[PDB]
Amino acid sequence: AEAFTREDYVFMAQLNENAERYDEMVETMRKISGMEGELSDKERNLLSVAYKNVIGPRRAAWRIVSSIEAKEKGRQKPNAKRIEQIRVYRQKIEKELSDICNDILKLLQEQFVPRSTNADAKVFYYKMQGDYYRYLAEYSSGEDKEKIAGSALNAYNSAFEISQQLPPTHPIRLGLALNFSVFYYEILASPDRACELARKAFDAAITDLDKLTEESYKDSTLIMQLLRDNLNLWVT
Amino acid sequence: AEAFTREDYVFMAQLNENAERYDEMVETMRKISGMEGELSDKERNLLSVAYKNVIGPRRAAWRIVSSIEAKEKGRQKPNAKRIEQIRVYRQKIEKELSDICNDILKLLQEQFVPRSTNADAKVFYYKMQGDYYRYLAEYSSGEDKEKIAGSALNAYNSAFEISQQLPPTHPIRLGLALNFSVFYYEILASPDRACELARKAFDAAITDLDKLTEESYKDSTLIMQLLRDNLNLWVTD
């Protein structure tokens, strides 16, 4: 008559986190995603954290094995067998990346975004979708990377359209701006768009800087704004 | 394409380590353990590195969860729902700890220590048994632990015996001393013997510190030895 409630599943997610056992954290959060309702702001962050700490170590391992492979291929007297040994290892890690990415992209598409009713929640999920597409795009090529990049672009634009409603100083809105910019520069090969989106988001945040500051420092905040004002103006 | 060879598998072991993927390291190192002969010093490190970084995370988690259990129990308003949750979770980690320990202790007792021909290697493998027995003793309870502590104490004493053949500055010897001393202190609750064993190990090493020291820094080693000597004679009185 006194079994587990939702609070108790959130607790395991936190306990998992504390123990740094993120595979289990992903499963505990998956349980909560299967439940009815919308994820709280606490629960959305636990989701993000879990999946970040599962995909994170793989991207690190991928980058290390990729770099080692680059070195072995660029040799004066290359060893085709060792090169293959590495290449096959990378491919294994690439399979784990796409599994993890695929997994969360499913949940976002089929569960989270369809069941979402809030504005800030929509932006969070659309941002997340765009991120994990960007991670797929980081080791893809050809029609795969084009198709992946296209979906990443959509997710981010959806995120970006709705993010207009939230205040310029909102973490999720700034967070989108940061990643979407990095998406333009590092994937889509678009430095202008990257530079400009980062600039505009940053400037919007600089306008409301007084809202992030205590009244104790509001005059320092103002000179900073004025410095930015003059800087913009020059460049006239 | 050609068959992988021992030298290929040592490279994978090392790739595994670079990627910080220690499950795959423990596997490719198990694969080398099955191949001909005895493990080289390089390979014994890889073996050690692999099992340490698999067990290590579990011990970290076990300590964190045990700490959280402690807090939750000593609350003004303890949460019976959580304490059951935490307990079961600790126990899951304890199982994982036990599987990892058995895996390697089994390997040591059936493969490495039997096929060991060197003194160097014998100490390393006996030390290892002591260590992984100690890790079982770390969370084991009551009567069961005592049996484990005995196995640890045995393996460590065996290590300690053959260790006397190795120089006082030899890493395996100093390594054994460190862990045996920790075993006394933390498992056997024997601070007396812990300090004696660590102190002796440490002093025999300071005596030979000239051998670890470069030619350019010998005068500093000597003043350090004389400082040690004076401290021992002064602490007396």
Author numbering:
A (entry chain A): 2 to 237
B (entry chain B): 2 to 238
Task: Copy text verbatim from the article accompanying this structure deposition.
Interestingly, two post-translational modifications (PTMs) make g14-3-3 unique in the 14-3-3 protein family: constitutive phosphorylation and polyglycylation.
The structure of the g14-3-3 was determined at 3.2 Å resolution in the P32 space group and the asymmetric unit contained two functional dimers. Each g14-3-3 monomer displayed the typical 14-3-3 structural organization with nine antiparallel α-helices (A-I) arranged in a ‘U’ shaped fashion with a large central binding groove. The g14-3-3 N-terminal dimerization relies on residues largely conserved among the 14-3-3 family members involving, in this case, three salt bridges between Arg22 and Glu97, Asp9 and Lys82, and Glu25 and Lys93. A possible consequence of such exposure of hydrophobic residues is the observed domain swapping occurring between the C-terminus of two g14-3-3 monomers, each belonging to a different dimer, in which helix I' from a monomer interacts with helices F and H from the monomer of the neighboring dimer. Domain swapping entails a dimerization event at the protein C-terminus with the formation of a four-helix bundle between two adjacent g14-3-3 dimers, leading to the assemblage of protein filaments.
